[PDB]
């Protein structure tokens, strides 16, 4: 009958993509396979990503800090694209005090052990002079898909949410000549996440997430 | 006439969506008709959307 397929291999690459293969396949099963976990995968993947910020000068995202050369909303973008990993908890306070000349990056962060910063060179301001300090407070929470503040105190500011850690998905079907049986097919799975999802854990969910919607009708 | 003026800056901020008119440098109009999803759009060999 129909050959199980299963995880046989995770070759990770770099620490943002990594490339997964699902071997053996029948004929027609590893486009078919292929196309529903990219899909799966870009779309529904659990995120990390930052909801709302506090910085302690700043009314407005449409002003400026003095002694930090960015715009308020540049910094507001510079954090929606940080990349960190929860693990305990759906919504934490992340805290960033950085005060001198230089790059404020993600590692001047506190750490809040059981969240990781997975790319600590991540610059999210800089601070030109020595008498400037900045004094922030970030809500990293779980989510998923795009929730754009349009949808959901007066020193708040509102960030868009991009909870999707995966940022290309791509596969290959090839011919795995394997277990003495020709014309059966090996599906090769190359993602690109930005480093907070294991990509086994990855192709599990989305697979989980395809088994859950077939229960409709069986 | 008039005793006291009050001027308040709204800074009102517009993404995209279907309807606003885009274009090029070449005379090729268009409306946005629909925001696709980012899994529904074509794709290369190496994954990238267009």
């Given at each position: 009958?129909?050959?199980?397929?299963?995880?046989?291999?995770?070759?990770?690459?770099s620490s943002t993509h990594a490339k997964v293969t699902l071997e053996p396949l029948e004929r027609g099963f590893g486009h078919t396979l292929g196309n529903a976990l990219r899909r799966i995968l870009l779309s529904s993947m659990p995120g990390c990503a930052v909801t709302e910020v506090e910085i302690d000068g700043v009314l407005h995202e449409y002003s400026t800090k003095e002694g930090v050369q960015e715009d308020i909303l540049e910094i507001l973008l510079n954090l929606k694209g940080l990349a960190v990993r929860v693990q305990g908890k759906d919504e934490v306070?992340?805290?960033?005090?950085?005060?001198?000349?230089?790059?404020?990056?993600?590692?001047?962060?506190?750490?809040?052990?059981?969240?990781?910063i997975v790319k600590p060179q991540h610059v999210i301001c800089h601070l030109t002079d020595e008498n400037a300090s900045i004094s922030m407070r970030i809500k990293v929470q779980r989510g998923r898909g795009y929730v754009p503040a349009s949808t959901r105190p007066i020193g708040r500011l509102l960030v868009d949410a991009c909870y999707s850690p995966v940022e290309r998905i791509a596969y290959n079907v090839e011919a795995a000549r394997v277990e003495q049986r020709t014309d059966l097919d090996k599906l090769v799975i190359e993602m690109e996440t930005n480093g907070t999802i294991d990509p086994e854990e990855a192709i599990r969910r989305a697979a989980t997430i395809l088994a859950e919607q077939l229960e409709a009708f069986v | 006439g008039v005793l006291k003026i009050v001027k308040v800056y709204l800074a009102v901020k517009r993404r995209i969506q279907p309807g606003d008119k885009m274009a090029g440098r070449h005379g090729n109009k268009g409306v946005i008709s629909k925001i696709n999803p980012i899994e529904d759009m074509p794709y290369d060999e190496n994954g990238t959307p267009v």
């Open positions: 009958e129909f050959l199980k397929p299963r995880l046989v291999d995770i070759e990770q690459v306070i992340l805290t960033l005090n950085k005060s001198g000349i230089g790059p404020v990056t993600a590692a001047d962060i506190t750490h809040d052990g059981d969240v990781e | -």
